[PDB]
Every structure is written in structure tokens, then in C-alpha cells.
Write a protein that binds this ligand. Structure first.
Ligand SMILES: Nc1ncnc2c1ncn2[C@@H]1O[C@H](COP(=O)(O)OP(=O)(O)OP(=O)(O)O)[C@@H](O)[C@H]1O
Ligand SMILES: Nc1ncnc2c1ncn2[C@@H]1O[C@H](COP(=O)(O)OP(=O)(O)OP(=O)(O)O)[C@@H](O)[C@H]1O
Ligand SMILES: Cc1c(Cl)ccc2c1ncn2CC(=O)C[C@H]1NCCC[C@@H]1O
Ligand SMILES: Cc1c(Cl)ccc2c1ncn2CC(=O)C[C@H]1NCCC[C@@H]1O
Ligand SMILES: [Mg+2]
Ligand SMILES: [Mg+2]
Ligand SMILES: [Mg+2]
Ligand SMILES: [Mg+2]
Ligand SMILES: [Zn+2]
Ligand SMILES: [Zn+2]
Lengths: 474, 487
């Protein structure tokens, strides 16, 4: 039983939700968390979707080394100068000092791009589109939290190289849309697509696109996935060049993108859809969509007749026929785990050709005829998915509003909301917003489709260049 | 490709793995990039093994890569001989860590502390977890792409059971699955066996293994490992439960652990590769058939028609589940493509030219034999699928007969030494003592014209040991033991 309340102390509600759902176990190294099968299976569903989609775009899977040499990492600013403290360094094997220390990838640009330079000697050799599923380490400064901000995490990073800007620019938005599908269609989480401001964008790229999600219970936004156009910053840095097709002896630098998505997805799913009864799984990612619990031989045969029939309609179902646990225990158990539907069968319903289905999201008990099983259970699963998305949508609309001068901006921000405001775009101004609201508010993204069109000649909260989504964030 | 596999094995191997576009070199010694052509093979192995272990009830998870200094040293999980292979993170940025942290060389000390917390009663067993992950071992021995790399990808399975008989049954099920990966996927024959006392995982009860043979070097290699740990680790980490029906007794879990790595791909390369390059077994080839337009005089519409035919073969082949690629690139000649996909080891090259179209035929060329066949266009799905099956059987049959030729029996040290020096591995009567196995290693080095180590005690040796047979020292022999020079 979960005894914390998401409204009371978010930090202790989250800790008990991830542990009692058997998603997370704690490790003795700060910011490192064990992914138990319940959590890992969600990542695997995400991985199945994204991998298939990027494969349609021509991207191929690979695996590059985890260790990055001091020269390659230092080669040029993959990072900016402040990222250096988050890099973990190996300096010895056993008791023997390494001649030069080696770093654990915090990202793989500096591992991959020297090889890209070797593979590209003509425009024939482009595009290169590689993706890897792997683990990366960042010795994070902020307070660690499972799946939101971890010291080690799992991700996919995609790195693609092109002959022209226009090819690259198209992929950036293709990948971002796929990140948006993961959140919206898989995890039933609504997101805002946008571009990072000068201050918040990756210093190694030209522009950074992003999807931002909102976590009501904290009043904070969070970056869900990232898709950069690196332009020619890295190809100039690593000499990824090909020969001009028309002009003797003349070199062109490749255009590059890089994009990544992490297990942070699962934490956002938890923070958005979790309730005071525990985890709530969107059916699309639930490895168990229906759990069957009997409330011997006659009644179980009915339970297994339901479970074979549900498998026959491609529904992921588990029959919890264990005799060593009381039904009440099972109810609590699978509710904490967030199974979308509990299918209860008692002696009463069996004789009636009946059963009761309990949806995890709303709690309604539904009495359905036995014949009705595959058709009605799948209809409930799709309404749970739609219901979870609709509830989080209307929650996002409620907490994302518009203000046009600083005093109005703060009042909404202090009410636990994020707001789109007319913005200079300049770093000095964004710093000032950061400390005036302080607890300080950051820019989240410049939305592709802002709530309002910017008023003719409107000024920042210099003239305004764009409505920018601001808020307190992770 | 310049080098020849029989002349200089190391440079042939370096040339096959790079010109097949499997491997790229890194500036960290013993670390190698897995380009998509190699990684697709890993994915094929992964897809098979993963499905199989799920049938056995094993679940997938992911445990931290970092091992605290205290946890790694807290218990005797490994012999101190392994300490030099552990890589240590000692600082972030320029700030030294208060305590250094180790990179997982294996995950016992990370997992088993959590197993102890999760095991509170008999209800909590069995625990069967598997993780696909990367591991670091600062190898002293000569690193080689995929055979011995300082970072590698693997699967490690760790299971805990209430009873010994459950544990023991799984050890051999996993061993059998490893044997199916090598034999049915990679077409490599293997010898199942048990490791000698010297060669076993010191922390377990017994170690089973599959051993593979690489003829061109006359050297064997450990292809996969499956341990019964008994209760050695459950006692160290207190993975215990009280059976209420057995009041006053602590029930220590019976455990297994098992692992398989990207060494698989290197053995496949070494076993089936030839002087034209890689040879992929159809079962793991990410491209089973490459379609190449030939003979491209032709109007633009005619050329478009010939590409249309190539794409129609590609949809026909996809429709019966053959993995196919149409190399429709206009910037390379057909002859270039022939060589390119041969170096990559594609099982079947399907050539289509304009005369072939008008004739309603195509040409299929098998990578394993080089045989060219003219096939009727209507017969494409059935004939290509039949050839793919015969390639697979051909590759396994060749490597089988090669293993049979190079694995023989000797009952005297002098015969053992002579047979060994001919590039073979040998089953000999062996006492089993560690001192003796050391003796054999340095005598087979001294008296050679690299010492030989024990490979496994075969489950099914070639000959039965005679009553009162004595070892090749003077102690009696306990069992026929497979010996050889090894990677
Ligand atoms: N410590 C972390 N734990 C989990 N996910 C993370 C962590 N740091 C970054 N991410 C995620 O990685 C994705 C791509 O990595 P990237 O380098 O763009 O992150 P970032 O800009 O440093 O993120 P943030 O400001 O949210 O820490 C982001 O969309 C973010 O969701
Ligand atoms: N450096 C390595 N690179 C690739 N695979 C490896 C490496 N070391 C071990 N393996 C493989 O990992 C499997 C399981 O790991 P394990 O620790 O049992 O190996 P091991 O006994 O140390 O190996 P070896 O005798 O080759 O040194 C072995 O069966 C072997 O095939
Ligand atoms: C600590 C640190 C360093 Cl040292 C260097 C770059 C870093 C970083 N933290 C964040 N980035 C930026 C990136 O990772 C760019 C993109 N890499 C590919 C996947 C998507 C990702 O956004
Ligand atoms: C360097 C080093 C250390 Cl420091 C510690 C244990 C080691 C090791 N080298 C080898 N083993 C032995 C193992 O890994 C045992 C089993 N672990 C589960 C998967 C299969 C594997 O056989
Ligand atoms: Mg960061
Ligand atoms: Mg950022
Ligand atoms: Mg070893
Ligand atoms: Mg060994
Ligand atoms: Zn301003
Ligand atoms: Zn002996």
C-alpha cells in the first residue's frame, strides 16, 4: 500500500511509487538506479517503436566504444567549457595507472566523428545515418532522482551526416516528431515542440529543437527529448569533408544532426499519470494490459479460458493463479504496478457467464458478459489510453497560459503554471528573468505553434522576437 | 583483399573485418567500433537468445555499470588474480572522488546485494534476471577484434532457486541454447563440457562450457559459459529464506550465472571466412540476397524497367521473409558490386540483366561455393530459399568435418605432444589435478616444434576411459579431458 500522497510531498510519493511498483531498486552509488523488469519492459516498448520508425528513415544501428580519449574529447568544444565537471575519468586498471586517463562517454560525438571523417571521401559516402542504444555517464550537478536526472542512464543517440543543409534540416524535424509520438501516442503525455533560445541551445549545434512536458504536481516543466542541427560545427572540427562535385580541388564540410532520448521518459510517465494508488500504465506500453485474478478446477479453467482468448486477440494478459496470495493482495499488487485493467472472476460471475473489469485510471467496475470479452476489453484499453492523454492534455492547457509583462508573468508562475511570454531572446535578458523570478524560471522552448500570435510591434517583458515558453524546470 | 588466411592469419583477419565494414579501429587500445554490418549479427544472436530465455521464464533488466569500492571487495566474488583487469573511475572533471568506483567487469557484486533484499520467503524465488550490456575488462592477453576486447557487449544471466535440482536443470538448458547459437545460427560446431578444477570459475560449484575450434590457428576458444554456483554466493550475500515447514533452518538460494559475448562474431569470421572475405551464415546474414542490375545503349525507360524488375524481385523475396537488398546505385559498376558484397559475405548474389528479363530468368551465385545457377523467374521464392538452406547446411557440414579431423584421442604424453604440434586439439586421460595441468602447460610449451591448456571435460568424449587407465603424468585418470592451444 502506498501511504504518501502526490499532492502532499512529491519526493516521497515518487520514491514509494517506483519502489513498490517494482520499477526501481536503489544502488549504493548516488544517482544510479537499478531498472527492474517492470521498468525495463517500458523502455523496451519505447525502443521497439522508435527503432522501427528510424529504420524506415534509413538509420542503421551500431555500437561505438564507451571510452573516449583525452585528445578526441579535447579536440574541440563538443561541449562548452562548463560541461567538463560531469565527465567521469578512468585513470588506472587495478593498481596500475593508465599512461593517459580515458573518459566515459557523456555523449558520443567525439567518439563517432573521427570515424565519420575517415569514411567520407566523396559525396557518394553521404548520408551517414547511425544510431546506438547505449548507456552514458554524466556526474550530474543537481539533485539525483530516479529516471529524471540520473548519473548513468540509458538512451539512444542518433548521429547523421549529409551533403546538403536541406536534407539535414528535414531529418531534425522528422526525429522530433517521432519523439513527440513516443510521448503522445505511447506514453499518453502531451508535449510542446519548440526551439531552444540562444542561452539554452546546445553550444555545439546551430539550433536545438525539443519537446517539453509539464509535471503539474511539481509545477515544473521538463525536457523530454532533443534533436539538434549541428550544421558544420563538428565537421569543421573533425574534418569530415568531401570533394566538391563541380569544382576541382574544393572541399565541402558535411552537414550533421544528432538527437537523443532517454529513460527519463518513464519518470515523466510516472509523474504525469501516477495517482495516490500507485503507478498508472498507458496500455500501449503496458507489458501486462489485463491481469486476471480469481476471487478449484472449475473457476481457474474459466480464468485460463479468458487468458487464452485474450492472447488470441493480441492482448497482453497475465493470469495470477497463485494460490499463496489472497485476492486482496493481488488487487493491491497489480494496482501499484499500474496494470490498466483488473479482470476479477468469482464463483458468482462464472455461473452467470459474467466478469467484472476494473480500469486503473478511473476505478470504474464494469460488469461484462463473458462472450463480450475480447471486444469489450480492447475497447476499454483504448479509452484508458485516450482518457489518460485527455486528462493530461486539459491539465497542460490549464497550466500553460500567456502573459505580456513581467508582473503578470510572476503571478502565474507563482501559481504553479508555465507561461508563454514575448521575449527579446537575448542572454542578458534571460539571465535577468532567471533571478527576478527567483526557484528561477528558465526558458523551456520557443513553441513552433505558440498560443497567440505576437502582437504587432510588441515589446519583450528591446522588442519581442517570439513568444517563448518559460517556467520552472528540472 | 591481399592476405591469405592460411599464410598470415592476423593480417587476413584484420583485412576481412575492416573491408567487410564490420570493424573500425579506435584510439583506445583493445576497443573497436562495431559498424552496422557487425552489429546486425549481434542483433540476430540477441533476438534468438532473448526469445528462448523468455520461454524459460527469464526476465530482462538493467543494473548499474558502476561498482562501489566497498561492494566489489566486500565479498570473495572473484580471485585476486582478476584485480588487475578492473577499470577504476577516480575523478569527475578535475575533482577526485572520495572513493574510487569500478566499471562492471561482471555484475555479481551489483546484483546479488539486491537479490538478498528481494528474497524474504520461498514466494520470492525463483529470481531469473538477464541483462544485455557492455562490460570492461582491462585484458592483459593480446586483444583482438571480437575475440578478446577490453570493452565488449554481452548477456549475463543470473538466477536464484529454492532447490538444487531447479538450478542444475537450468545450467544445462542455457548451455544447450549457447550450443544452438553457435551450431544452428552461426553454423559452428562446438564441444560441450565441464571445466577442470583449474579452469573453472573459482566462486562456483562447477563451470560448463562450449569450446570452438579455429583450424587456421589450430587453437580452441571458449564460446560461452554456464556456472552452477550452488550456495557459495547466497551464503556470502545472505540470500536466505525461512521455510516455516522447516523451523530453525536457513535456506540459502541455489544460483547459476551464465554469459555469451560478441566473441561469437569473431569465431564465425575465423571459421567460415575465406580469401575472398567474409562468409555469412544465411541464418544471421542481415542481407541474405543482394540484387544487382547488370548490363546497363539502353533507353532511360529501358533502364527504369530493369530497375523495376530488380525491385519486383525484392518485394517477392521480402514476401517470403528473405532479407534482401537491391543495390540500385548508379555510381558503381556491377563488377565492383560483385566484389563488394562478396567481401561482405552475402550468401546469394542475384544478377538481373536485360537479356535475363526478356528470357524470364535470373542468375544466382552462392557465396560459399561460387556456383552460378540460371533460375526461372517464376521459381524465385522457392529456389532462393532452398539455396539459402543448403548454404547454411554446407557451412556447418564443412566446419563439422574440420572439427572431427582435428580432434583426436591420445593416451600418452608423447603422442599428445606430437598431435598437438600438428595443429590439433586432443582428448587425453587426465587426473584432474591443478599441479598436473600446470605441468602439461609448460611441458607442451618446452617440448614443442605456446603451451596447451585444458579446454573442457567433454560430456560425450570420443572414447570410454579404460578401467584403471592412468593419467598422462603418476595418478589414475579420472576422465578424458579435451586439451589444446587456446585463444
Ligand atoms: N541526467 C539525466 N538523466 C536522464 N535523462 C537525461 C539526463 N540528462 C539529460 N537527459 C535527457 O537526455 C536528452 C538528450 O540529452 P541532452 O544532452 O540533450 O540533455 P540536456 O540538454 O543536458 O538536458 P537537461 O537540461 O534536461 O539536463 C534530453 O532530452 C533529456 O531528456
Ligand atoms: N575480453 C573478452 N572479449 C570478448 N568475449 C569475452 C572476453 N572475455 C571473455 N569473453 C567471453 O565471455 C564469456 C563469459 O565470460 P567469462 O568471464 O566466463 O569468460 P572467461 O572465462 O574470463 O574467458 P577467457 O577464458 O576467454 O578469458 C566467455 O564464455 C567468453 O566467450
Ligand atoms: C556533459 C556533456 C558533454 Cl561533456 C558534452 C555534450 C553534452 C553534455 N551534456 C549534454 N551535452 C549535449 C549532447 O549530448 C548533444 C546530443 N548528443 C547526442 C544525443 C542528443 C544530445 O542532445
Ligand atoms: C575480471 C573479472 C572479475 Cl573482476 C570478476 C569476475 C570475472 C572476471 N573475469 C571473469 N570473471 C568470471 C565471471 O564473470 C563469472 C560469470 N559472470 C556472469 C556471466 C558469466 C561469467 O562467466
Ligand atoms: Mg546536462
Ligand atoms: Mg538544456
Ligand atoms: Mg578472462
Ligand atoms: Mg576461462
Ligand atoms: Zn527583455
Ligand atoms: Zn595428471
Amino acid at each position: 500500500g502506498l501511504e504518501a500522497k502526490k499532492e502532499e510531498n512529491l519526493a516521497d510519493w515518487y520514491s514509494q511509487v517506483i519502489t513498490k511498483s517494482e520499477m526501481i531498486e536503489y544502488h549504493d552509488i548516488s544517482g544510479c538506479y537499478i531498472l527492474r523488469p517492470w521498468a525495463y519492459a517500458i523502455w523496451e516498448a519505447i525502443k521497439d517503436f522508435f527503432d522501427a520508425e528510424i529504420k524506415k528513415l534509413g538509420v542503421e544501428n551500431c555500437y561505438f566504444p564507451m571510452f573516449v580519449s583525452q585528445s578526441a574529447l579535447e579536440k574541440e568544444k563538443t561541449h562548452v567549457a562548463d560541461f567538463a565537471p560531469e565527465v567521469a575519468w578512468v585513470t588506472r586498471s587495478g593498481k596500475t595507472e593508465l599512461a593517459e586517463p580515458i573518459a566515459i562517454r557523456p555523449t558520443s560525438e567525439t567518439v563517432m566523428y573521427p570515424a565519420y571523417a575517415k569514411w567520407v571521401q566523396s559525396h557518394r559516402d553521404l548520408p551517414i545515418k547511425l544510431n546506438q542504444w547505449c548507456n552514458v555517464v554524466r556526474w550530474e550537478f543537481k539533485h539525483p532522482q530516479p529516471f529524471l536526472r540520473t548519473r548513468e542512464f540509458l538512451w539512444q543517440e542518433g548521429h547523421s551526416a549529409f551533403a546538403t543543409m536541406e536534407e539535414a534540416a528535414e531529418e531534425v524535424l522528422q526525429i522530433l516528431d517521432l519523439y513527440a509520438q513516443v510521448y503522445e501516442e505511447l506514453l499518453a503525455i502531451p508535449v510542446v515542440k519548440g526551439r531552444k533560445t540562444e542561452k539554452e541551445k546546445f553550444a555545439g549545434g546551430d539550433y536545438t529543437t525539443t519537446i517539453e512536458a509539464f509535471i503539474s504536481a511539481s509545477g515544473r516543466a521538463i525536457q523530454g527529448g532533443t534533436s539538434h542541427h549541428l550544421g558544420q560545427n563538428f565537421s569543421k572540427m573533425f574534418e569530415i569533408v568531401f570533394e566538391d562535385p563541380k569544382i576541382p580541388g574544393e572541399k565541402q564540410f558535411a552537414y550533421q544532426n544528432s538527437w537523443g532520448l532517454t529513460t527519463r521518459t518513464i519518470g515523466v510517465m510516472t509523474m504525469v499519470h501516477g495517482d495516490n494508488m500507485g503507478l498508472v500504465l498507458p496500455p500501449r506500453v503496458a507489458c501486462v494490459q489485463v491481469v486476471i485474478i480469481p476471487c478449484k478446477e472449475a473457476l481457474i479453467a474459466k480464468c485460463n479460458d479468458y487468458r487464452r482468448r485474450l492472447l488470441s486477440v493480441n492482448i497482453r494478459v497475465r493470469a495470477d493463479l497463485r494460490d499463496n496470495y489472497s485476492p486482496g493482495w493481488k488487487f493491491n499488487h497489480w494496482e501499484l504496478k499500474g496494470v490498466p485493467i483488473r479482470l476479477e472472476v468469482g464463483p458468482r460471475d462464472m455461473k452467470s457467464c459474467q466478469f467484472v473489469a476494473v480500469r486503473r485510471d478511473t476505478g470504474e467496475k464494469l460488469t461484462v458478459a463473458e462472450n463480450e470479452a475480447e471486444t469489450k476489453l480492447q475497447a476499454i484499453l483504448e479509452d484508458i489510453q485516450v482518457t489518460l492523454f485527455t486528462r493530461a492534455s486539459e491539465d497542460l492547457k490549464t497550466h500553460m497560459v500567456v502573459a505580456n509583462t513581467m508582473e503578470d508573468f510572476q503571478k502565474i508562475l507563482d501559481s504553479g503554471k508555465i507561461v508563454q511570454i514575448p521575449f527579446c531572446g537575448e542572454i542578458d535578458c534571460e539571465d535577468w528573468i532567471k533571478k527576478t523570478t527567483a526557484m528561477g524560471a528558465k526558458s523551456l522552448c520557443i513553441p513552433f505553434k505558440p498560443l497567440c500570435e505576437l502582437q504587432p510591434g510588441a515589446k519583450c517583458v528591446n522588442p519581442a522576437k517570439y513568444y517563448t515558453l518559460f517556467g520552472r524546470s528540472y
